[PDB]
Design a protein around this ligand. Sequence first.
Ligand SMILES: *[C@@H]1O[C@H](CO)[C@@H](O)[C@H](O)[C@H]1NC(C)=O
Length: 437
Amino acid sequence: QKIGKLTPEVHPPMTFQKCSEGGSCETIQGEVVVDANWRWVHSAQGQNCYTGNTWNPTICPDDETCAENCYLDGANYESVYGVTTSEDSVRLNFVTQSQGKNIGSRLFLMSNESNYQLFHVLGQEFTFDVDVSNLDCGLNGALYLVSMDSDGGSARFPTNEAGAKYGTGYCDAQCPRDLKFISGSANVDGWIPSTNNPNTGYGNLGSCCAEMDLWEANNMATAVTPHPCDTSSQSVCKSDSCGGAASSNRYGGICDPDGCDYNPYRMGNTSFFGPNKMIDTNSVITVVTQFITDDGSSDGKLTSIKRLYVQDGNVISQSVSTIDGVEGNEVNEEFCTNQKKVFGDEDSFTKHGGLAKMGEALKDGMVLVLSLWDDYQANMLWLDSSYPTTSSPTDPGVARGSCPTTSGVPSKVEQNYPNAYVVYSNIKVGPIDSTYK
Ligand SMILES: *[C@@H]1O[C@H](CO)[C@@H](O)[C@H](O)[C@H]1NC(C)=O
């Protein structure tokens, strides 16, 4: 993609920490940018190349014809995207009405005005605060990590003039093919619109990389879920060999679309997480995620992922599983293989290399992604309700949270909770036990 400057591209700033020593963690001046797929992509003078769920064929009859003609512009962060930042905090609003309707956002955390901050968390801990008290069911405030190129994949593909500064180069473990630009190219060929999402279609190119979902949550539920791939770093896949949750053939690619997920509710403890629960979603939460390596080293093999929360002067560790026979409260090889078995779920995790392969991704730095969105594909029922709905709520793995099966319908959540928002803050990356104090 080429760059247009009808509106200047000004990143909202946000500080985070690196705890090199203990221990009074020291600041760093980051800045956040929005995924380019949320941006306006217009001709020279001056119409849209892409509208809703499709490309304009007079401007874009193919990848290069399209890419030659199309420009990516600045984002009005507060006005159109409901995105604002202050000190060490960032706010994402669900529905924003300007002169046009926007829904959610996906943001990336930079060091500079040209580079995504890479986080090397292996043998470390990543810690953050978050406010999910304003979210509700059918909504997902995700904070996660993906093996994106630090420069947005501008070096590796010459046709990408925009780079990280304009939020380019996204990938995750779904090998999404709804991205407008992938590996420099415009993703025009074989475009089909999605059957029920008006903001999305699917092209021949998908964008694959390892993804560690530290946090996918609303006030009714949460889940931490590593997704390894065969090729960890950015890779292009083609057509349905991309796999991903977004197709029928989700297990047909190089990435794990399902993950080894830990949902406190799904592992049987339904009093642990919710409004007025042990972990109170009406109050701010500190969430701690430690990545234990083979020999306690930032270059060792990843053996387990641990979860502590800090709320009201209580370091509370992750609720223990209560399902026979899935013991413990931490995602490790033992846990994941058992989890997948007792729940009759396809163990794509182990097939795509389990924790060892995730370790490889984390070893190379990863890019932090902050997002808010609703779910045309599955109505967020897999996060916060009974799933699949056909199944029995009493069968193990089925119940993920309290929400009714009738929740999560995109346009019903957009009418009921358009003003929902998530606030992430207080980001820190330092040695184990050296962030939460
Ligand atoms: C749920 O988890 C909390 C906090 O770990 C624990 O104190 C409580 O006893 C657990 N209860 C059940 C039923 O699992």
